Amino acid sequence: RTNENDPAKHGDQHEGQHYNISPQDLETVFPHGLPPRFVMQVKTFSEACLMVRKPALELLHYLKNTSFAYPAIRYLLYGEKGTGKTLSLCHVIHFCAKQDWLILHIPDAHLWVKNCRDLLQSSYNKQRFDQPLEASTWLKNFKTTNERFLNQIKVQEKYVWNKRESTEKGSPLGEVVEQGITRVRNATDAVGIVLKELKRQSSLGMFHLLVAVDGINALWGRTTLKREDKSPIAPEELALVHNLRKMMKNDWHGGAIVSALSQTGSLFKPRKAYLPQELLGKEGFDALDPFIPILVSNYNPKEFESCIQYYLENNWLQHEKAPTEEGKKELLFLSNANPSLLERHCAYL
RNA sequence: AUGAGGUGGCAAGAAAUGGGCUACAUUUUCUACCCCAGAAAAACGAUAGCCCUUAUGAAACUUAAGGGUCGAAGGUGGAUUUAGC
Ligand SMILES: Nc1ncnc2c1ncn2[C@@H]1O[C@H](COP(=O)(O)OP(=O)(O)OP(=O)(O)O)[C@@H](O)[C@H]1O
Ligand SMILES: Nc1nc2c(ncn2[C@@H]2O[C@H](COP(=O)(O)OP(=O)(O)O)[C@@H](O)[C@H]2O)c(=O)[nH]1
Ligand SMILES: [Mg+2]
């Protein structure tokens, strides 16, 4: 536990201690993305406490040393399953949001590339496919996270939604987002327009952009979605995926592209694929490189004690032997300091 | 000719019954995977029927296999009753 709640002052001195996110900030900045199990824990406890760690502090120092004049640099948080990459990305997202950044956050790319009942054909490009439901979902999440910047940011082009309906240069980005949401048919197109406008305006310096993409390995992998002829679909055929790759490019400046690999839900990948190349594949490695790889691993004994004491204080560990050092040692044995295994045991312990 | 040889052919269903397989689903449907996920959920449910193609073969309505098609009965079951330490 730390008294410091501002995400710009805390550093290594706070290592091994929880950092609280207020409910209002959780709602605004993080209406999505956060792991389902941590969401259940937050619902149970009324406390969104993430222990600060070297990975998150490192990437915060990276973003403080970043020069927006530089073309946006890529960072890649990689590791095994349940090492907390998602929560580190969320922590840094909170930092940038409190720093007034525009957070272009992708909660998970695995969802975008599977189980898409609504798969129409993009009007803007008849050779691609749209995912109106997911487009609307992410548009709503982005609006929730950056409503303030939504109005402040204007468009710089004419965008035709129908033969008679269009949006005009200089209009606020709110008009585009509203069109995408209400007119779900235009959802993917609005997502692409938003990505383009945010990229160009970050280049112009209207704000500072953090492109925080979770499970980035999905983009350059494979897809299970099948055409009306049952043919397989490659990722580029998904306008969302192609636009997200365009964003993953570093050609633009005015921000940084942070990403976090995630095997959870990955397609055709064996359970043990956790290395950057093994996940991204040749195409993904080639697209991301250059990148700064940051490892996320199990807990150390200090952070293990911090997590256990957090659960004990919250009384989550309602069993009698949980405070006992023997129970602590058994938890360490079973979870090998793995955050996800530890929590998935503590849930019924 | 109650012996021998050659060509062609039914191998069906009022009705009952024995055994087996598949189900009626949510402990399920589906993918990935081979067990830390996302969808389906009145859809589940035919190895049956119809058409086409492929393998075998001299010969495929005859057999088997693959695709499409159709999505039927049924929603845990009567008399009763089988097997297992
Ligand atoms: N810094 C942290 N503060 C609090 N809890 C944490 C922290 N890091 C990890 N945990 C706990 O670890 C659990 C497991 O993390 P989780 O699996 O969601 O992360 P991940 O790195 O995205 O992994 P996965 O590959 O499983 O998606 C989280 O639910 C959370 O309870
Ligand atoms: N409906 C619509 N969509 C647009 C328009 N302009 C841009 N977009 C969307 O914004 C995305 C980015 O556009 P852009 O990169 O310039 O097109 P591309 O380079 O040819 O792929 C596209 O995928 C479109 O879906 C427009 O005028 N109308
Ligand atoms: Mg994570």
Across-strand partners of A255? A209
Which nucleotides in chain B have some atom under 7 angstroms from a protein Cβ?
31-40
**Closest amino acid to nucleotide B30 (CA–C1'):** A115
Q: What are phi and psi of A156, to 5 degrees?
A: -135, 25
> Which two tokens mark A235?
């990722």
Q: How far is the CA of A280 from the centre of ligand 2 (A)?
A: 26
Please work out, in degrees rounded to the nearest 5, the angle formed at the alpha carbon of residue A208 by the alpha carbons of A168 and A239: 55
Protein residue with its CA nearest to atom 12 in ligand 2: A192
Residue A311: other Cβ atoms inside 10 A: 22
Neighbours of ion ligand 3 (CB under 5 A): A 85-86
Report d(CA A89, CA A50) in Å as an integer.
11
For residue A122, count other CB atoms closer than 10 A to its CB: 18
A29 ligand 2 Cβ < 6 A = no
Q: Which residue has the tokens 């050779």?
A: A127
Asked, as a colleague might, if the bond just before A339 is cis with ω within 30 of 0, I would say no
Give Cα A34 distance to the centre of its chain: 8
* DSSP category for residue A77: E
Task: With beta carbons less than 8 A apart as the criterion, state whether A204 and A99 touch.
Answer: no
Measured in angstroms, the resolution is 3.2
Taking residue A260's Cβ as centre, other Cβ atoms within 10 Å add up to 30
SS3 content of chain A, % helix, strand, coil (to 5): 45, 15, 40
